[PDB]
């Protein structure tokens, strides 16, 4: 039944009937063959995703769905730091509150309202059988019950072993099953002794039972606008993506420009990087951090463009304490970090590494 | 008391040099200066930087990664001094060197050394 | 009988076994209380020094404050702050000299003022507690200057600024009584009352002479500001008591810490802080031992306790160690603090039985000054 | 048999009794010679530190130099000056940081240059002698920096000016060969030659890797600049010798300080300055003792001596104490210095027979480093 | 060796605390840091101010005024520490009080303490 | 012989025939009744002395002869410190070399030359006897032998126990015959722990056999010109008394403004003080020194005038090392020092101590 529920969500996840013109499904943008992300090329590369209308582009990179089941529900913890939720800006409380939003989003799946979704579900004999067997008879005749029920099944699907296998190289090495190379182990060592582990580790101290390389916090690391992505999103050159402050109910101006710490699981295979796909190479993502630490002129230059990285989209709320560590990553250290981050690739996605 | 003998860890007293988490500590144990096993004494500043070591815990027979971090911006505590070197490497392998003052990234650019803490950050491997 | 190291380990293990997380951070010291005790380490005249903030009840270092060359500590009686006057040079022990006062928060230990003292005016001397002093309202710090002549500095803590120097007669130590009045002990053997304001010559009145030229009063008298009680031992253990609680100096009758027999056999006060006074119980405590007469800075092994209204001996404790300085917590059932320069160790005693309860060791290179606050 | 204190006692007695006058004055140190030896006291990471200037022959402290947080001492080979790079802060251990180089006259001990280093560049680590180094003309001081990246600082002593930072690869230590050239030790296992001008990017050229990743070279090699001989032991006792006298690195036969049978009985170098090098005798000295593999920073009680050319053992001394640091005087009939951190005592030995001749104690709080000047 | 016992002067070793001229010294004996019985070590500055004691010389049975003077401008030597108080008086009689750092009149206004010399200035009265 | 020579000297000392108009002898300006100093009032009070012509004044105060025989002859020692000699600027090498100069100096005794001195001695039958029994016959017929001989004898006479009796209270105290009052004792203790001992003590360390409270050195302590005195001397407003430098032979301009540390013995009864007699009161001479230490507005002020101490006559080569002690003398200690310095009064002049 928890099994049935998830099995029902597996049908919906790949069903283009959930979009307005039936040209797309969740799996369109979160492709199981590419670690549940978008392999498609739009006007701003793979930085942003094209919606159901074949024209509209969003303003943010589509993250993996892998391991998002482990993310706790949205909440401010006792040190006053907001934690968890879903979307890069946390504006959904959890996987259930999230699942309806792509459906109704005009630049994504673009259904006109809950009733329309219910009409699409009611038109399929397997959904009538599957839904009423779990949520009771007439569920699909009520827009709210139906839509709510479709969210429930999608979330349950996402919380199964297929989305979170824990069978990467890093996992087998922590189970004693094998050994890092020299280069890989150097990388881990660099990861847990340099500032990364202040953000991309579940716990501050102690061992995590199910590590996802994210403490679920929100941080502004001072990324620039993605010029082209922003041009394609059509949101206007006067727009500012305020991150977590944009969540309704958040009024603290200190939250402007802050975005949830992504999990580095499968990171090698989910580029381009960051909330606005600004960087295509994993090497570049890592080297961006050097700009707060390094004195060499080359650290002021984005190696993918040849130019200065660019000013922060939101110049306030930088996490300078964590970012100003006072130690630069040489290339030998960047190489190792890449190598180790590659070991967070799930088994099934190791073929992609090349 | 025999300094040249194998180090033998214990898990019953954090203020002793042979407490299991101090296997590669170099300086002073913060617990003896107003701090705690994994907190800094008031007035001082906590580094972000660390050196690391794999430390065998005799209680549960496992090995843990201790990311030693320095509390800085004060003169050295002088209390419960300790020098251990379990898996310690030369300065040219800095993530495992402990002669270095790992005060980097501390508030106010505090760089003097007061004492060290011993928080677990991983399982060894 | 389990130590603090042992408890912390046992808890660490349960946090580990339970998987209890916590964020490594900057602690706060517990809130100032009667059983807080500060120890200062002049470090045998070293250019940089340390103060140790101790919970007397647990026997635990709860903090430290760094200082320069022979700093003078004070501790506000209400617990609201602590402060010192200190000295530093542009190159360790050499080059340009800056004298300053720092005011710290008592639980963060963070500086809340740094007030520069112009013309390097502090008296550089083996630390005497009453060579720098707070006024009873906690608003003003007063410090002694020896050179080029006896004078008192006035520092406004509330406005965080130096006000003025005060010309004084040939007097020493500073015992505040009011926001605008303190007393000093002068070379002729009187006390002098100094009434001052922001500018003008201060009104300076001498008391009558209260001791002869060849009786020696120690550099470490106890003064309870909240009782207005000045308690001043001599080389022999004769104890002068002056009552200032009226705002003028009333000379109480003298008492003898030591019997004639003990005096005859060579018993004498000795050490550094040789005396303590508990306000609520009206008792005097005195470090004493058998010594030759010019060995008055040596450590002692005994404390005599006496009633301060009668002079009657209450008790003679055997301290078990070499003790240079003493003081008491100012609560009920008070602790008696016994500091050993030689052992670099604070032994903590029950003041009623004189039984050693616990000890704190590794307190620098030469700890010498114990300070408490009278919070009652 | 008559001590120095004793002799002094008779001289004073004889002056007094003959009516000899004499002006109390500032002494000068005797002139720099082969038997002069400098001992540095990092003081277990203390914020101020001391250097001790000693006559090796008499076994006498002849002067002293105060210093900041983890200073690096250098000594000029020709005896014309001594110097260190040091670090201070506006309030002891807190506030604004000043890094600086000070150069001193070696008989007056007065500063002759104070040269500030901009943006607080010094590497703060347990003192390694070759993290700060003089060029063989003595006109330039080169210091290492770790943060934010390996770099090298060029200070001009002659003009008394910091000039600039050299960007370098991931390399450690500074071994100068010429007025404009030095070597480092890089992570991969090579040495890097760094040739620099008064401006421009320096020319950097690697050698081949001369050791494996699993073979650990210590933080305290001996380098004779006048020989151009680098002498670098590993944790197990094997000894690399690099010849840089040509101005390029020619790697001599590796040698074994211990025999395979000793190594299987757990003989291993251990301590701080585990190795010394005598230029004239072409001779290597090494602190060894029986220990587990990861007690490498513990004190040793033996010194082996070997020929550099052939690798044959010449002597094995029982030092009689816990020794942490060794060095030698670079004259003929050299002394062998054995510094005991724990004992705070320099032990001065005959470097032929390894007999103890005399000692100097109370050497600060935790002394660690020995520096001589090769004046031959 | 019994610290509370009558001090007993000798006239055969100036680096011992029972040397006769050291009768009211407080700090460090300057001979032990490259100075001499009556000269400051290199690098330090000689105070003009002093404090006096009348010390008995067991070599000729006479007593001598020793006007102690500090060597200043350096951190304390730490070698041959000594504290004696024959005839020593509290602060309000400063000429005889030895708690005080008598560094006044030193060149460069040096006021830090390093060691103390013990020259004679005259006979006792 | 050593007896007779001095007896002869004792005659010449009080003999006014050695002056041009025979109004004046050594004992006029060096009066035994006032510790060998000038009690007479001239145009500048007792600051400088009037010559034999009734009119001319010197530019310098007349010092005590008492204890002058303990001063070594002029020399440079190993430290490069010139030491000793006679006169405030040391221009005579010793007592004999000095003795002649007053006789021939026109502002003082004012004889025209050696021959006229010989012509006066020759006129006395008691001089022909004494001189010829000591220096052989015909001495008084040769001007250069006779003048030299006169000096010899005046120097001998100055080296007697009459001039150096070591019978001050301070001496008697030191010999265990009496004790200091507490104030004298506190004054003594101050003297030996403050900067005074750095110049007003025979030696750098140890104990002198015969202490005269002076190290015979040369120092400029920054004294102003005494105007009334300088006017009386008529040397001109642009004159500068270069102290030691003015000795023929000295060329080191670092010796400009440096004068000989006077013995403090009998200081209490020989005011006014310093080389130009600029301070009337012993107390003022002690207080002058506070100018180098104190901060109080009163320390720049000469209490005798109510006006600033003054500009130094020679504002360079000041002994700042010794003078800047960092410690101001409070009134108690000035009282104490006055007291102690009175104990340096020779017994025969203790009666003088009242006035
Ligand atoms: C006549 C026989 C004598 C003798 C033996 C001395 N005097 Fe005088 N004297 C006078 C003044 C003003 C001074 C200081 C002058 C200067 O510094 O240039 C002196 C000095 C001396 C000294 C030197 C003393 C010293 O301690 O440095 C000696 C030894 C000495 N005198 C002996 C003033 C006068 C006179 C003024 C009218 C007359 C006449 C004399 N002196 C005569 C003699
Ligand atoms: C055409 C694009 C598109 C479609 C269709 C789409 N998504 Fe997304 N998805 C995104 C983008 C872009 C983001 C990041 C958006 C943001 O944060 O504003 C996102 C975010 C999410 C997140 C938050 C993950 C995180 O780490 O914050 C979840 C969960 C998710 N999608 C699940 C789904 C499900 C379930 C469906 C359909 C049943 C769906 N998505 C349909 C593009 C799409
Ligand atoms: C104090 C916070 C913080 C620190 C320190 C930090 N990160 Fe991040 N990191 C983030 C946040 C937040 C994001 C998402 C930011 C955004 O896109 O707006 C991010 C994104 C990334 C990404 C891109 C992942 C993706 O799917 O797009 C990589 C790779 C990464 N970090 C690696 C590192 C490494 C390697 C270090 C240090 C060695 C490091 N980070 C230090 C907060 C941090
Ligand atoms: C470093 C030199 C120096 C120091 C220090 C010094 N003096 Fe003098 N003193 C002199 C010299 C030189 C004279 C003569 C000055 C002159 O006439 O120009 C002098 C003159 C005097 C006189 C006048 C005596 C006379 O015969 O005219 C008295 C009185 C005196 N000093 C007392 C003191 C006292 C009291 C102290 C300190 C407490 C002191 N001095 C410190 C050098 C010194
Ligand atoms: Ca991506
Ligand atoms: Ca006079």
CSV table of N, CA, C and O in Angstrom, one decimal, chain D residues 15-89:
chain,number,residue,atom,x,y,z
D,15,UNK,N,88.2,43.1,43.8
D,15,UNK,CA,87.9,44.5,43.5
D,15,UNK,C,87.6,45.3,44.8
D,15,UNK,O,88.1,46.3,45.1
D,16,UNK,N,86.6,44.7,45.5
D,16,UNK,CA,86.1,45.4,46.7
D,16,UNK,C,87.3,45.6,47.6
D,16,UNK,O,87.5,46.7,48.0
D,17,UNK,N,88.0,44.6,47.9
D,17,UNK,CA,89.2,44.6,48.8
D,17,UNK,C,90.4,45.4,48.3
D,17,UNK,O,91.3,45.7,49.0
D,18,UNK,N,90.4,45.7,47.0
D,18,UNK,CA,91.5,46.5,46.5
D,18,UNK,C,91.1,48.0,46.2
D,18,UNK,O,91.9,48.8,45.8
D,19,UNK,N,89.8,48.3,46.4
D,19,UNK,CA,89.3,49.6,46.0
D,19,UNK,C,89.3,49.9,44.6
D,19,UNK,O,89.3,51.1,44.2
D,20,UNK,N,89.1,48.9,43.7
D,20,UNK,CA,89.0,49.1,42.3
D,20,UNK,C,87.5,49.6,42.0
D,20,UNK,O,86.6,49.1,42.6
D,21,UNK,N,87.5,50.7,41.3
D,21,UNK,CA,86.2,51.3,40.8
D,21,UNK,C,85.8,50.7,39.5
D,21,UNK,O,86.6,49.9,39.0
D,22,UNK,N,84.7,51.1,39.0
D,22,UNK,CA,84.1,50.5,37.8
D,22,UNK,C,82.7,51.1,37.5
D,22,UNK,O,81.9,51.1,38.5
D,23,UNK,N,82.4,51.5,36.3
D,23,UNK,CA,81.1,52.1,36.1
D,23,UNK,C,80.1,51.1,35.8
D,23,UNK,O,80.2,50.3,34.8
D,24,UNK,N,79.0,51.0,36.6
D,24,UNK,CA,77.9,50.1,36.1
D,24,UNK,C,77.5,50.5,34.7
D,24,UNK,O,77.1,51.7,34.4
D,25,UNK,N,77.5,49.6,33.7
D,25,UNK,CA,77.2,49.9,32.4
D,25,UNK,C,76.5,48.8,31.6
D,25,UNK,O,76.2,47.8,32.2
D,26,UNK,N,76.1,49.1,30.4
D,26,UNK,CA,75.6,48.1,29.5
D,26,UNK,C,76.8,47.3,28.9
D,26,UNK,O,77.6,47.8,28.3
D,27,UNK,N,76.8,46.0,29.2
D,27,UNK,CA,77.9,45.2,28.6
D,27,UNK,C,77.7,45.0,27.1
D,27,UNK,O,76.6,45.3,26.5
D,28,UNK,N,78.7,44.6,26.4
D,28,UNK,CA,78.6,44.2,25.0
D,28,UNK,C,78.8,42.7,25.0
D,28,UNK,O,79.4,42.2,26.0
D,29,UNK,N,78.4,42.0,24.0
D,29,UNK,CA,78.7,40.5,24.0
D,29,UNK,C,80.0,40.4,23.4
D,29,UNK,O,80.5,41.3,22.8
D,30,UNK,N,80.7,39.3,23.8
D,30,UNK,CA,82.0,39.0,23.0
D,30,UNK,C,81.7,38.8,21.6
D,30,UNK,O,80.6,38.5,21.2
D,31,UNK,N,82.8,38.9,20.8
D,31,UNK,CA,82.7,38.8,19.3
D,31,UNK,C,82.3,37.4,18.9
D,31,UNK,O,82.7,36.4,19.5
D,32,UNK,N,81.4,37.4,17.8
D,32,UNK,CA,80.9,36.1,17.2
D,32,UNK,C,82.1,35.2,16.7
D,32,UNK,O,82.9,35.7,16.0
D,33,UNK,N,82.1,34.0,17.2
D,33,UNK,CA,83.1,33.0,16.8
D,33,UNK,C,82.3,31.6,16.6
D,33,UNK,O,81.1,31.6,16.6
D,34,UNK,N,83.1,30.6,16.3
D,34,UNK,CA,82.6,29.3,16.0
D,34,UNK,C,81.8,28.6,17.1
D,34,UNK,O,80.8,27.9,16.8
D,35,UNK,N,82.1,28.9,18.3
D,35,UNK,CA,81.5,28.2,19.4
D,35,UNK,C,80.3,28.9,19.9
D,35,UNK,O,79.7,28.5,20.9
D,36,UNK,N,79.9,30.0,19.3
D,36,UNK,CA,78.6,30.7,19.6
D,36,UNK,C,77.5,29.9,19.2
D,36,UNK,O,77.5,29.2,18.1
D,37,UNK,N,76.4,29.8,20.0
D,37,UNK,CA,75.3,29.0,19.7
D,37,UNK,C,74.1,29.7,20.2
D,37,UNK,O,74.1,30.2,21.4
D,38,UNK,N,73.1,29.8,19.4
D,38,UNK,CA,71.8,30.4,19.6
D,38,UNK,C,70.7,29.3,19.8
D,38,UNK,O,70.6,28.4,19.0
D,39,UNK,N,69.9,29.5,20.9
D,39,UNK,CA,68.9,28.6,21.2
D,39,UNK,C,67.6,29.4,21.3
D,39,UNK,O,67.4,30.4,22.0
D,40,UNK,N,66.6,28.9,20.5
D,40,UNK,CA,65.3,29.5,20.4
D,40,UNK,C,64.2,28.8,21.2
D,40,UNK,O,64.1,27.6,21.2
D,41,UNK,N,63.4,29.6,21.9
D,41,UNK,CA,62.3,29.1,22.7
D,41,UNK,C,61.0,29.6,22.2
D,41,UNK,O,60.5,30.7,22.6
D,42,UNK,N,60.3,28.8,21.3
D,42,UNK,CA,58.9,29.0,20.8
D,42,UNK,C,57.9,29.0,22.0
D,42,UNK,O,56.8,29.5,21.8
D,43,UNK,N,58.3,28.5,23.1
D,43,UNK,CA,57.5,28.6,24.4
D,43,UNK,C,56.1,27.9,24.3
D,43,UNK,O,55.2,28.5,24.8
D,44,UNK,N,56.1,26.7,23.7
D,44,UNK,CA,54.8,26.0,23.5
D,44,UNK,C,53.7,26.9,22.9
D,44,UNK,O,52.5,27.0,23.5
D,45,UNK,N,54.0,27.7,21.9
D,45,UNK,CA,53.0,28.6,21.2
D,45,UNK,C,52.6,29.9,21.9
D,45,UNK,O,51.7,30.5,21.6
D,46,UNK,N,53.5,30.2,22.9
D,46,UNK,CA,53.2,31.5,23.6
D,46,UNK,C,53.3,32.7,22.7
D,46,UNK,O,54.1,32.7,21.7
D,47,UNK,N,52.6,33.7,23.0
D,47,UNK,CA,52.5,35.0,22.2
D,47,UNK,C,53.8,35.8,22.3
D,47,UNK,O,54.0,36.7,21.4
D,48,UNK,N,54.6,35.7,23.3
D,48,UNK,CA,55.9,36.3,23.3
D,48,UNK,C,57.0,35.2,23.6
D,48,UNK,O,56.6,34.3,24.3
D,49,UNK,N,58.2,35.3,23.0
D,49,UNK,CA,59.2,34.3,23.0
D,49,UNK,C,60.6,34.9,23.2
D,49,UNK,O,60.8,36.1,23.1
D,50,UNK,N,61.6,34.1,23.5
D,50,UNK,CA,62.9,34.5,23.8
D,50,UNK,C,63.9,33.7,23.0
D,50,UNK,O,63.7,32.6,22.7
D,51,UNK,N,65.0,34.4,22.6
D,51,UNK,CA,66.2,33.7,22.0
D,51,UNK,C,67.3,33.8,23.0
D,51,UNK,O,67.5,34.9,23.6
D,52,UNK,N,68.1,32.8,23.2
D,52,UNK,CA,69.2,32.8,24.1
D,52,UNK,C,70.5,32.7,23.3
D,52,UNK,O,70.7,31.9,22.4
D,53,UNK,N,71.4,33.7,23.5
D,53,UNK,CA,72.8,33.7,22.9
D,53,UNK,C,73.7,33.2,23.9
D,53,UNK,O,73.9,33.7,25.0
D,54,UNK,N,74.4,32.1,23.5
D,54,UNK,CA,75.3,31.3,24.4
D,54,UNK,C,76.7,31.2,23.8
D,54,UNK,O,76.9,30.9,22.6
D,55,UNK,N,77.7,31.4,24.7
D,55,UNK,CA,79.1,30.9,24.4
D,55,UNK,C,79.1,29.4,24.7
D,55,UNK,O,79.1,28.9,25.9
D,56,UNK,N,79.2,28.5,23.7
D,56,UNK,CA,79.4,27.1,23.8
D,56,UNK,C,80.6,26.6,24.6
D,56,UNK,O,80.6,25.6,25.2
D,57,UNK,N,81.7,27.4,24.5
D,57,UNK,CA,82.9,27.0,25.2
D,57,UNK,C,82.8,27.1,26.7
D,57,UNK,O,82.9,26.0,27.3
D,58,UNK,N,82.5,28.2,27.2
D,58,UNK,CA,82.3,28.4,28.7
D,58,UNK,C,81.0,27.7,29.2
D,58,UNK,O,81.0,27.3,30.3
D,59,UNK,N,80.0,27.6,28.3
D,59,UNK,CA,78.7,27.2,28.7
D,59,UNK,C,77.9,28.3,29.4
D,59,UNK,O,77.4,28.1,30.5
D,60,UNK,N,77.9,29.5,28.8
D,60,UNK,CA,77.4,30.7,29.4
D,60,UNK,C,76.4,31.5,28.5
D,60,UNK,O,76.6,31.7,27.3
D,61,UNK,N,75.2,31.9,29.0
D,61,UNK,CA,74.3,32.8,28.3
D,61,UNK,C,75.1,34.1,28.3
D,61,UNK,O,75.5,34.7,29.3
D,62,UNK,N,75.3,34.6,27.0
D,62,UNK,CA,76.0,35.9,26.8
D,62,UNK,C,75.1,37.1,26.4
D,62,UNK,O,75.4,38.2,26.5
D,63,UNK,N,73.8,36.7,26.0
D,63,UNK,CA,72.8,37.7,25.7
D,63,UNK,C,71.5,37.1,25.4
D,63,UNK,O,71.3,35.8,25.6
D,64,UNK,N,70.5,37.9,25.1
D,64,UNK,CA,69.2,37.4,24.9
D,64,UNK,C,68.4,38.4,23.9
D,64,UNK,O,68.7,39.6,23.8
D,65,UNK,N,67.4,37.8,23.2
D,65,UNK,CA,66.6,38.6,22.3
D,65,UNK,C,65.2,38.2,22.5
D,65,UNK,O,64.9,37.0,22.5
D,66,UNK,N,64.3,39.2,22.6
D,66,UNK,CA,62.9,39.0,22.8
D,66,UNK,C,62.2,38.9,21.5
D,66,UNK,O,62.6,39.6,20.5
D,67,UNK,N,61.1,38.2,21.4
D,67,UNK,CA,60.5,38.0,20.1
D,67,UNK,C,59.0,37.7,20.3
D,67,UNK,O,58.5,37.5,21.4
D,68,UNK,N,58.3,37.8,19.2
D,68,UNK,CA,56.8,37.7,19.2
D,68,UNK,C,56.3,36.3,19.0
D,68,UNK,O,57.0,35.3,19.5
D,69,UNK,N,55.2,36.1,18.4
D,69,UNK,CA,54.6,34.8,18.2
D,69,UNK,C,55.3,34.0,17.1
D,69,UNK,O,55.4,34.4,15.9
D,70,UNK,N,55.8,32.8,17.5
D,70,UNK,CA,56.6,31.9,16.6
D,70,UNK,C,57.5,32.6,15.6
D,70,UNK,O,57.3,32.5,14.4
D,71,UNK,N,58.5,33.3,16.1
D,71,UNK,CA,59.5,33.9,15.3
D,71,UNK,C,60.4,32.8,14.6
D,71,UNK,O,60.6,31.8,15.2
D,72,UNK,N,61.0,33.2,13.5
D,72,UNK,CA,62.0,32.5,12.8
D,72,UNK,C,63.3,33.2,12.9
D,72,UNK,O,63.5,34.3,12.4
D,73,UNK,N,64.4,32.7,13.6
D,73,UNK,CA,65.7,33.2,13.7
D,73,UNK,C,66.5,32.9,12.4
D,73,UNK,O,66.4,31.8,11.9
D,74,UNK,N,67.4,33.8,12.0
D,74,UNK,CA,68.4,33.5,11.0
D,74,UNK,C,69.7,34.0,11.7
D,74,UNK,O,69.6,34.9,12.5
D,75,UNK,N,70.8,33.4,11.3
D,75,UNK,CA,72.1,33.9,11.7
D,75,UNK,C,73.0,34.0,10.5
D,75,UNK,O,73.2,33.0,9.8
D,76,UNK,N,73.7,35.1,10.3
D,76,UNK,CA,74.6,35.2,9.2
D,76,UNK,C,75.9,34.4,9.4
D,76,UNK,O,76.6,34.6,10.5
D,77,UNK,N,76.3,33.6,8.4
D,77,UNK,CA,77.5,32.8,8.4
D,77,UNK,C,78.8,33.5,8.8
D,77,UNK,O,79.6,32.9,9.5
D,78,UNK,N,78.9,34.7,8.4
D,78,UNK,CA,80.1,35.5,8.7
D,78,UNK,C,80.1,36.3,10.0
D,78,UNK,O,81.0,37.1,10.2
D,79,UNK,N,79.1,36.0,10.8
D,79,UNK,CA,79.0,36.7,12.1
D,79,UNK,C,78.6,38.2,12.1
D,79,UNK,O,78.7,38.8,13.2
D,80,UNK,N,78.3,38.7,11.0
D,80,UNK,CA,78.1,40.2,10.8
D,80,UNK,C,76.7,40.6,11.4
D,80,UNK,O,76.5,41.8,11.6
D,81,UNK,N,75.8,39.7,11.5
D,81,UNK,CA,74.5,40.1,12.1
D,81,UNK,C,73.6,38.8,12.4
D,81,UNK,O,73.9,37.7,11.9
D,82,UNK,N,72.6,39.0,13.3
D,82,UNK,CA,71.5,38.1,13.5
D,82,UNK,C,70.2,38.8,13.2
D,82,UNK,O,70.1,40.0,13.3
D,83,UNK,N,69.2,38.0,12.9
D,83,UNK,CA,67.9,38.5,12.5
D,83,UNK,C,66.8,37.5,12.7
D,83,UNK,O,67.0,36.3,12.8
D,84,UNK,N,65.6,38.0,12.8
D,84,UNK,CA,64.4,37.1,12.8
D,84,UNK,C,63.2,37.8,12.2
D,84,UNK,O,63.2,39.0,12.1
D,85,UNK,N,62.3,37.0,11.7
D,85,UNK,CA,61.0,37.5,11.4
D,85,UNK,C,60.0,37.2,12.5
D,85,UNK,O,60.0,36.0,12.9
D,86,UNK,N,59.2,38.1,12.9
D,86,UNK,CA,58.4,38.0,14.1
D,86,UNK,C,57.1,38.7,13.8
D,86,UNK,O,56.8,39.2,12.8
D,87,UNK,N,56.2,38.5,14.8
D,87,UNK,CA,54.8,38.9,14.7
D,87,UNK,C,54.3,39.4,16.1
D,87,UNK,O,54.6,38.9,17.1
D,88,UNK,N,53.6,40.6,16.0
D,88,UNK,CA,53.0,41.1,17.3
D,88,UNK,C,51.6,41.6,17.0
D,88,UNK,O,51.2,41.7,15.9
D,89,UNK,N,50.9,42.0,18.1
D,89,UNK,CA,49.5,42.3,18.0
D,89,UNK,C,49.3,43.5,19.0
D,89,UNK,O,49.9,43.6,20.0
